[PDB]
Amino acid sequence: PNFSGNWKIIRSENFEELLKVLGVNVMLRKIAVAAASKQAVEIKQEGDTFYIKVSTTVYTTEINFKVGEEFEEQTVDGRPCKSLVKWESENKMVCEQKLLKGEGPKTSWTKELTNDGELILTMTADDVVCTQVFVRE
């Protein structure tokens, strides 16, 4: 359905704990938590092809993928990874990531459109799950 839209964050939970698992030191975690509270997500969806632009005050990144086809992006802490997205249901998809180089926590993400019109993003590193909730602009 309708992932397409301009989304603004209303809630961000456990993001600091996620970055801590990923090795980010305390001062940068605090500043990253602050940046995340200004997160905006623009999505264009055509069938199972997605164009996604995630931005904060000073940074913007574009994620392009097709469900079921491997692509390359970065982990939350900025390491290059190979990613693969699959549907889990009508309006939820799940992305598994694999580091291109080296070792690290096992990371993934999910994107879900709820019946109440919220977009829920989850980001995971090992046992720690960050949940972010967005509404349409």
Ligand SMILES: *C/C=C(C)/C=C/C=C(C)/C=C/C1=C(C)CCCC1(C)C
């Ligand atoms: C479908 C939506 C997706 C896959 C959103 C991904 C979002 C990110 C990779 C956000 C990353 C951020 C940081 C790594 C620190 C700066 C603040 C964020 C939350 C924009």
